[PDB]
Amino acid sequence: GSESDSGMASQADQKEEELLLFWTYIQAMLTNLESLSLDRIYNMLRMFVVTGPALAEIDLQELQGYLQKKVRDQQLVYSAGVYRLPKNCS
Amino acid sequence: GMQIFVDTVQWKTITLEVEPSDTIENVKAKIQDKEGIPPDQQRLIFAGKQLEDGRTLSDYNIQKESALILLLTLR
Amino acid sequence: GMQIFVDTVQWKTITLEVEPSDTIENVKAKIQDKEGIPPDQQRLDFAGKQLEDGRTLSDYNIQKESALILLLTLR
């Protein structure tokens, strides 16, 4: 029962909500499936980006830069060339 | 001697059939029935949209060989 | 009607005890007895290295409470 949680920007709404959807995949994915290559979640985001008008399809720098941000926010843990969520803070 | 934790992961795709005139509740119920997939515990997103029970397959335009993602309990 | 694909995640951590003197085929037969986990259908991984069943636990220097992730049939 959630509807009004989108805001009003007349442009940036869709974008935030598309990226938040992508994060709804990768967050809930790594919550249990806590071990996957960038290429796996890349293939998934790109599937759900091409199926709709989501950003008119993203790019490497966007998706890689998304992971990069998460790591630099400490909201992603980079293992040995493989991504997983910090299910522990410390 | 010493113990080990063996983490069994099942990351895999399943295949089923469905009709356009069926509701979404039937899809989540039939994967629950067959595979033991708990619908609310494992939240579904189809083609980049979250599924409302009250809607039909045709409502979202479920074409053939279409892919659904199953995300386990997040929040 | 139309046939669709549902992409399932099911992760679970098991706990057993093993000996340093035992072979990996012991651990194999344990998971294969417990949940019917077939080694040929789902090979075990340890820090990015496959456990060959002909090897020994001490051969890998296995620690107590060591975590190993079983990946789907991939060599």
Swiss-Prot record, chain A:
It comes from Homo sapiens (Human). The lineage of its organism: Eukaryota, Metazoa, Chordata, Craniata, Vertebrata. The modification Phosphotyrosine is found at residue 78. Together with the RING-H2 protein ANAPC11, constitutes the catalytic component of the anaphase promoting complex/cyclosome (APC/C), a cell cycle-regulated E3 ubiquitin ligase that controls progression through mitosis and the G1 phase of the cell cycle. The APC/C complex acts by mediating ubiquitination and subsequent degradation of target proteins: it mainly mediates the formation of 'Lys-11'-linked polyubiquitin chains and, to a lower extent, the formation of 'Lys-48'- and 'Lys-63'-linked polyubiquitin chains. Belongs to the cullin family. It comes from the Eukaryota. The mammalian APC/C is composed at least of 14 distinct subunits ANAPC1, ANAPC2, CDC27/APC3, ANAPC4, ANAPC5, CDC16/APC6, ANAPC7, CDC23/APC8, ANAPC10, ANAPC11, CDC26/APC12, ANAPC13, ANAPC15 and ANAPC16 that assemble into a complex of at least 19 chains with a combined molecular mass of around 1.2 MDa; APC/C interacts with FZR1 and FBXO5. In the context of the APC/C complex, directly interacts with UBE2C and UBE2S. Interacts (via cullin domain) with ANAPC11 and with UBCH10. Interacts with NEUROD2. Interacts with FBXO43; the interaction is direct. This is Anaphase-promoting complex subunit 2.
